[PDB]
Every structure is written in C-alpha cells, then in structure tokens.
C-alpha cells in the first residue's frame, strides 16, 4: 500500500500482510514491439517489482516469470498562460513476462 506507514520489522517478527491493497495498475499497449510473453503495465511509484509479481499472482492468478520496472519522466516543458511550468506526472512502467510459455 501507498501513503500508509509500514509496521517496522524486527528480526524474528511476524510476516507483513496487506489485506486491502490500495495499489491500482493499468495494463497498457506497448509503444514499441515487445516479445509475445511480455505484458506492460503502469503502476504506482511505490509499487516494487516484487509487489507487482505478488499482486498479479495473488489477485489475478497470473504466473509471472520476470518483472522489470523503470521510471518515466513526465515533461515539465509546458507553460500555462501565466508562463508557469505545467508538470506531466512521472509514472512507473513495469514489464511482466508470463511463465509457462504463456
């Protein structure tokens, strides 16, 4: 989850669990050519690739072989009528490769 404090973990403590994850992701069409087994997502900044693999497997029962992420810079070039920069938000892109030859 995002915008929530994580309970601090001490060696030998219980497992960290999230019952109602507030992570929302978008499956998106690749801008360029991708391998057949590759699925592209837009995810929140705080979501790690480990989260995404558990998120897809846990909630959607999608076997995930590999996950890679990157941070896309959003243009800050646009200026409004007051000559003030307008920020296109940065977003994280994830590349998921399906397991079992799917």
């Amino acid at each position: 989850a995002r915008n929530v404090v994580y309970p601090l973990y001490r060696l030998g403590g219980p497992q960290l669990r999230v019952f109602r994850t507030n992570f929302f992701i978008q499956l998106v069409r690749p801008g360029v050519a991708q391998p057949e087994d590759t699925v592209q997502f837009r995810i929140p900044m705080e979501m790690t690739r480990v989260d995404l693999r558990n998120y897809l497997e846990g909630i959607y029962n999608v076997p995930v072989a590999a996950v890679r992420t990157r941070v896309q810079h959003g243009s800050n070039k646009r200026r409004d009528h007051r000559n003030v920069r307008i920020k296109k938000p940065d977003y994280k892109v994830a590349y998921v490769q399906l397991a079992h030859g799917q």
Binding site: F24, I25, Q26, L27, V28, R42
Partner: peptide
C-alpha cells in the same frame, strides 16, 4: 483496474 485500463 479494468476501468483504469480502458481509460488509458
């Protein structure tokens, strides 16, 4: 998630 996907 499905609606967010469709929106994009």
């Amino acid at each position: 998630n499905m609606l967010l996907t469709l929106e994009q």
